[PDB]
Design an enzyme around this catalytic site. Structure first.
Site, PDB file in Angstrom:
ATOM      1  N   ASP A   1      -2.873  18.332  26.989  1.00  0.00           N
ATOM      2  CA  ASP A   1      -1.860  17.098  26.985  1.00  0.00           C
ATOM      3  C   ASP A   1      -0.809  18.681  26.626  1.00  0.00           C
ATOM      4  O   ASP A   1      -0.304  19.673  25.460  1.00  0.00           O
ATOM      5  CB  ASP A   1      -1.437  16.643  25.849  1.00  0.00           C
ATOM      6  CG  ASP A   1      -0.424  16.102  26.287  1.00  0.00           C
ATOM      7  OD1 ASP A   1      -0.327  15.032  26.720  1.00  0.00           O
ATOM      8  OD2 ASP A   1       0.650  15.100  25.318  1.00  0.00           O
TER       9      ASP A   1
ATOM     10  N   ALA B   1      -0.725  19.987  39.413  1.00  0.00           N
ATOM     11  CA  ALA B   1      -1.610  21.228  39.478  1.00  0.00           C
ATOM     12  C   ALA B   1      -2.198  20.297  40.664  1.00  0.00           C
ATOM     13  O   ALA B   1      -2.525  19.464  41.194  1.00  0.00           O
ATOM     14  CB  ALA B   1      -2.121  20.660  38.602  1.00  0.00           C
TER      15      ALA B   1
ATOM     16  N   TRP C   1       5.089   8.362  41.488  1.00  0.00           N
ATOM     17  CA  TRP C   1       3.870   7.308  41.655  1.00  0.00           C
ATOM     18  C   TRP C   1       3.223   6.567  40.656  1.00  0.00           C
ATOM     19  O   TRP C   1       3.200   5.727  40.451  1.00  0.00           O
ATOM     20  CB  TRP C   1       2.594   8.342  42.369  1.00  0.00           C
ATOM     21  CG  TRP C   1       1.417   7.973  42.274  1.00  0.00           C
ATOM     22  CD1 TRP C   1       1.202   8.032  43.449  1.00  0.00           C
ATOM     23  CD2 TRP C   1       0.547   8.389  42.054  1.00  0.00           C
ATOM     24  NE1 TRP C   1       0.496   6.726  43.649  1.00  0.00           N
ATOM     25  CE2 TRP C   1      -0.861   7.482  42.425  1.00  0.00           C
ATOM     26  CE3 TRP C   1       0.269   8.844  40.273  1.00  0.00           C
ATOM     27  CZ2 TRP C   1      -1.873   7.215  41.899  1.00  0.00           C
ATOM     28  CZ3 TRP C   1      -1.091   8.673  39.842  1.00  0.00           C
ATOM     29  CH2 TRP C   1      -2.149   7.838  40.929  1.00  0.00           C
TER      30      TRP C   1
ATOM     31  N   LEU D   1       0.770  15.958  45.734  1.00  0.00           N
ATOM     32  CA  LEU D   1       2.471  15.665  45.795  1.00  0.00           C
ATOM     33  C   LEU D   1       2.974  16.631  44.448  1.00  0.00           C
ATOM     34  O   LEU D   1       2.401  17.267  44.016  1.00  0.00           O
ATOM     35  CB  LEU D   1       2.448  14.303  44.810  1.00  0.00           C
ATOM     36  CG  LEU D   1       1.744  13.100  45.114  1.00  0.00           C
ATOM     37  CD1 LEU D   1       1.992  11.754  44.276  1.00  0.00           C
ATOM     38  CD2 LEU D   1       2.423  13.179  46.968  1.00  0.00           C
TER      39      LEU D   1
END
Length: 315
Positions: A221, A137, A162, A154
């Site tokens: 989540d 995001a 990562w 990213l």
């Protein structure tokens, strides 16, 4: 909490505070007629790194203590992790997030009130569960930071690699390290962990039975959102763990998402020592007040960011 090569005697500064430990209903549904029902205590952790009067990065983590008679099931949930990128990166973000996350995982100085009906003493036996969802995001904590010149954004696969790197480094010797990429095939998932001997495909939760009795519903989540639907539509009684993860793959978040992934690690039967570690603790209202102020800051604007920071220092 961090090494001197990073802080550099005042070049950088930290914001770190916890909520006062607060009893909540279990994030994992427990039947009323279940042997040894546990008490659930939740602590919110907020960390930010400052450089002079600018925010550099932030990390929010929730710790849940499921307190049984002789042990604790301890869940550590990464809520949010983000960078601002107003200035040229001078430290690798991982060298800050890793140690801070490890600190939070291993923190054991909570001041927990007795349950109604001084402070409570926790069992020394703790079983650790670390849970992180990787979902790319532009902004997770710092509104409008996406257009900042030095924010390194990213893609999903890069973000996953990562996080695997970070988590592997702070879960050395743990009993398992699980990766799931809902909707991906086993080979595609295995590629991300081929160089990590201790990692395997799957998840850390109970494999059988009803999903709501196995999978914690964490705030904001991807699993949690689907769990919320299952519960609202009163299908909590039929949906199994396997079917949950099967259907999770077809959710818009995943199917239209960019390598959205779920990481879980466990460490069983860790004997832990209580140790008071004087950190700032705040009421949940004070915590929410800080977070609400944060969400109204334009993090593309040095003025507003500096204002936010100096205002925090005032308190």
């Amino acid at each position: 909490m961090l090494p001197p090569d990073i802080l550099q005697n005042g070049e950088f500064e930290t914001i770190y505070f916890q909520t006062n430990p607060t009893y909540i209903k279990s994030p994992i549904h427990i039947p009323k007629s279940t042997l040894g029902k546990p008490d659930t205590v939740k602590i919110r952790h907020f960390f930010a790194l400052l450089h002079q009067d600018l925010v550099v990065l932030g990390l929010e983590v929730f710790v849940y203590l499921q307190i049984y008679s002789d042990f604790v099931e301890k869940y550590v949930y990464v809520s949010k992790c983000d960078t601002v990128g107003l200035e040229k990166s001078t430290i690798k973000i991982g060298k800050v997030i890793g140690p801070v996350l490890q600190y939070i995982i291993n923190y054991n100085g909570y001041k927990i009130k007795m349950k109604n009906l001084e402070y409570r003493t926790l069992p020394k036996t703790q079983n650790l569960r670390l849970c992180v969802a990787t979902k790319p995001a532009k902004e997770y904590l710092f509104p409008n930071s996406a257009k900042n010149p030095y924010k390194n954004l990213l893609n999903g696969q890069s973000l996953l690699r990562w996080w695997i790197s970070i988590i592997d480094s702070i879960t050395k010797g743990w009993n398992n390290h699980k990766l799931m990429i809902p909707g991906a095939d086993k080979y595609a998932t295995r590629k991300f962990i081929e160089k990590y001997s201790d990692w395997s495909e799957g998840h850390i939760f109970k494999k059988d039975g009803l999903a709501v009795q196995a999978i914690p519903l964490f705030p904001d989540d991807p699993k949690g959102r689907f769990l919320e639907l299952v519960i609202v539509e009163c299908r909590y009684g039929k949906m199994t763990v396997s079917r949950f993860y099967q259907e999770l793959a077809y959710r818009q978040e995943f199917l239209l998402g960019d390598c959205v992934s779920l990481i879980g690690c466990c460490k069983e039967n860790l004997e832990v020592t209580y140790h008071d570690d004087l950190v700032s603790t705040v009421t949940i209202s004070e915590y929410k007040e800080f977070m609400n102020l944060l969400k109204l800051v334009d993090f593309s604007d040095r003025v507003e960011v500096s204002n936010f920071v100096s205002n925090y220092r005032k308190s």
